[PDB]
Design a protein around this ligand. Structure first.
Ligand SMILES: Nc1ncnc2c1ncn2[C@@H]1O[C@H](COP(=O)(O)OP(=O)(O)O)[C@@H](O)[C@H]1O
Ligand SMILES: Nc1ncnc2c1ncn2[C@@H]1O[C@H](COP(=O)(O)OP(=O)(O)O)[C@@H](O)[C@H]1O
Ligand code: MET
Ligand SMILES: [Mg+2]
Ligand SMILES: [Mg+2]
Length: 714
């Protein structure tokens, strides 16, 4: 009773149903099958139907609504719906009654129209295909500039990707826009949640006539945004001309995506908020409606408490879609992604994209991150030259995709990083002396973190460098940053005490915590994610800084503005202290008294620094002499410093209270200054020799000079 062609179309659609593993074969599956069927295809072509725009829509509906049965043991195979059988019987009854031999696809197509409540019938009516057109086919023949504006125009073609679900939110927006006062919807939600999607989706509903009667003549023009808009062009005169052009007496809605840029954040010149607040009630011969978009926090403080327009807008909470609602969203977009990637995603991969992104991609939200994993996974197939189809198993693909987004970044094996880290303790020991323990405890902690051992939610290392003044605490961290090849961010905590400096001259506390949070600390760590953060004199810092520090050491993040701006994941935090000296006896309790157990227990290590021995002080002196020798040897000048003069430099360049802090000046005043004259207009111009000695019963340095081409004669 049925054609060979139609019987094939049925079998091929039955085939797709036990591969996608559908429990139901529906009327929508039937129309989908009919797109392959020559008679139904020619009928639809006759009415000027874009087969693809119908293809994508049927496919999207089918995947969102058909139950999936890959579970276990219990009896399930594809079962046609009562409705599906009803359409075929309607087609056979009509054909037999018409005097025709067999049922063709075009006859089944006529039978679908009679399923009054079906989606298949609904789509045929949307594509403007009437039942009469198929009957007659069978019988006879045996304003703004340039950005992403005018969403109504983008909807009539195919620029806007479809909006799935969210009826309550659109309904609420339409109702808000329909009010007499406070007519302006304000979509509030996290990034990726689907705010732009709702605005764009509204423009489609206006075109489709699914927003009737008084909102038919509406057009949604989208403005340009995305935190302060004034570069060049004078914002005040272009906007005034725009709002007036939007007003000739029309029902024009203006979508301002990321509305916190113009208003709330505080601009430089006028116009901005001041001009947008103007047209909201009645300050002309007309009125405009605005759809805004912002995040939870930027609505909370900068919009509602600071107040720029808050009351005139109606807030609509746009929540993150749940797992199953996101599965429906992905299922509704899946066919267009599959067409583009030439690949098929299994229902298990779809659920996995959603569920794995929820668990592991915490920095992002719902639809957005799940859609990016799905797009990324399909693109990934191309890299295997062809694009390997994907049978019934894709979870593993999704797992690699999610793993790459969620984590990974680190090179650390058999060479470059290996040699540096294996010699880090030796490289530092050749610049900082008498503190082998400190260096060893520090490098042990770096290597450990570099081996992938440690936490991902915490800094590379959090250390408390404790010890006396001038023993190598600052020098070690400066060198640590030079040996690791990373930036050095330095902050003095004595400049971050809240109100201690006044009677002198300096005084600036509206910042401090505001200096660190608002800008400085956050800005520096965003600019240089891989760095060593040195905080001098940590004991002098205000408790607000300590809470901020307690968060860094726990969360690995710090928040000034959202999207989790400051990332301390790749930072070596170093805090130096002069607190409990290793006029105080120290063996235990001293450092413990000054810093709370809560702050101390978040440290990776309290790295202790000892006093400098007599031998160490001499090594420091030699280091200064060798640096000078390096400079002098290049100019053909040889510097020799005697033992007695080395003892004299050691004596003068080391205070027990100040450490080796006075050494640089002592070396400068006694070894560098006395050679300037001779190197410029004396015996050392063409090279030579300097001998520095000591005159004992005088305790002052002796300076001998000798010159020559090289060392010719004496
Ligand atoms: N309900 C939806 N149906 C289909 N796609 C959606 C839906 N909601 C969001 N998306 C998609 O997810 C992404 C995030 O949506 P978007 O509107 O940009 O979120 P937001 O504007 O809040 O940052 C966009 O690619 C959008 O196409
Ligand atoms: N342990 C040391 N090894 C090598 N040089 C040192 C040592 N200690 C102090 N110096 C010299 O004296 C200066 C002061 O040391 P620094 O690390 O700044 O002191 P602090 O431990 O108080 O932070 C250094 O810049 C360095 O020139
Ligand atoms: C599985 S979609 C079709 C089910 C039913 N004919 C209604 O609804
Ligand atoms: Mg200081
Ligand atoms: Mg110090």
């Amino acid at each position: 009773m049925l054609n060979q062609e139609l019987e094939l179309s049925l079998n091929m659609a039955f085939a797709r149903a036990r591969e996608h593993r559908h429990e139901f074969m529906t009327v929508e599956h039937l129309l989908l099958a009919l797109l392959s069927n020559p008679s139904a295809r020619e009928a639809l072509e006759a009415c000027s139907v874009d087969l693809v725009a119908l293809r994508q829509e049927l496919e999207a509906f089918i995947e969102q609504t058909t139950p999936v049965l890959p579970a276990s043991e219990e009896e399930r195979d594809t079962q046609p719906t009562l409705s599906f059988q009803r359409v075929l019987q309607r087609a056979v009854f009509h054909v037999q009654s018409s005097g025709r031999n067999e049922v063709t696809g075009a006859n089944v197509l006529v039978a679908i129209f009679s399923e009054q409540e079906s989606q298949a019938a609904y789509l045929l009516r949307k594509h403007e295909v009437s039942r009469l057109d198929v009957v007659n086919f069978i019988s006879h023949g045996t304003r703004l500039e340039n950005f992403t504006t005018n969403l109504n125009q983008l909807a009539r073609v195919g620029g806007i990707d479809p909006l799935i679900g969210r009826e309550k939110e659109l309904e609420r927006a339409i109702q808000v826009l329909c009010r007499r006062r406070k007519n302006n919807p304000l979509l509030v939600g996290e990034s990726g949640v689907g705010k732009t999607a709702i605005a764009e989706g509204l423009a489609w509903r206006i075109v489709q006539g699914d927003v009737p009667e008084v909102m038919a003549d509406c057009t949604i023009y989208s403005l340009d945004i995305g935190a302060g808009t004034k570069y060049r062009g004078d914002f005040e005169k272009r906007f005034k001309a725009l709002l007036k052009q939007l007003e000739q007496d029309t029902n024009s809605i203006l979508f301002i995506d990321e509305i916190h840029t113009i208003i709330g954040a505080g601009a430089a010149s006028g116009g901005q908020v001041d001009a947008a607040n103007l047209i909201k009630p009645l300050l002309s011969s007309g009125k405009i409606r605005v759809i805004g978009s912002t995040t939870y926090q930027e609505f909370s403080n900068i919009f509602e408490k600071d107040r720029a327009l808050a009351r005139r807008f109606q807030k609509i909470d746009i929540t993150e879609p749940s797992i199953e609602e996101t599965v429906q969203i992905i299922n509704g977009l899946k066919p267009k992604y599959e067409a583009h990637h030439d690949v098929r995603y299994t229902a298990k991969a779809v659920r996995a994209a959603v569920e794995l992104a929820v668990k592991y991609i915490n920095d992002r939200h719902l639809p957005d991150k799940a859609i990016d994993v799905i797009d990324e996974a399909g693109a990934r197939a191309r890299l295997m030259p062809v694009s390997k189809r994907k049978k019934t198993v894709n979870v593993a693909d999704i797992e690699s995709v999610v793993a790459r987004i969620a984590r990974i970044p680190e090179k650390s094996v058999s060479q470059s990083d290996r040699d540096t880290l294996k010699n880090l303790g030796d490289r530092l020991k050749m610049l900082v002396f008498g503190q082998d323990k400190a260096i060893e405890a520090l490098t042990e902690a770096i290597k450990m973190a570099r081996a992938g051992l440690g936490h991902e939610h915490k800094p590379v290392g959090s250390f408390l460098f404790a010890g006396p003044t001038g023993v190598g605490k600052t020098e070690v961290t400066v060198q640590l940053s030079k040996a690791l090849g990373i930036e050095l961010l330095r902050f003095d905590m004595s400049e971050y005490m809240e109100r201690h400096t006044v009677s002198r001259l300096i005084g600036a506390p509206p910042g401090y915590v505001g200096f660190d949070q608002g800008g400085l600390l956050t800005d520096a760590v965003i600019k240089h994610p891989h760095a060593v953060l040195l905080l001098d004199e940590i004991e002098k810092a205000h408790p607000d800084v300590f809470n901020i520090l307690l968060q860094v050491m726990d969360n690995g993040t710090l928040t000034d503005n959202n999207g989790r701006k400051a990332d301390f994941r790749n930072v070596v935090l170093v805090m130096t202290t002069n607190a409990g000296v290793r006029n105080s006896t120290d063996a235990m309790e001293e450092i413990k008294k000054i810093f709370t157990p809560e702050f101390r227990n978040r440290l990776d290590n309290i790295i202790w620094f000892d006093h400098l021995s007599t031998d160490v002080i001499h090594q420091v002196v030699d280091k200064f002499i060798v640096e000078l020798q390096v400079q002098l040897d290049q100019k053909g000048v040889s510097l020799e410093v005697s033992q007695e003069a080395r003892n004299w430099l050691a004596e003068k360049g080391y205070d027990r209270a100040m450490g080796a802090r006075p050494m640089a000046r002592v070396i400068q005043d006694n070894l560098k200054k006395p050679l300037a004259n001779e190197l410029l207009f004396g015996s050392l111009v063409d090279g030579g020799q300097v001998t520095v000695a000591l005159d004992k019963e005088k305790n002052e340095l002796t300076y001998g000079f000798q010159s020559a081409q090289k060392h010719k004669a004496e």
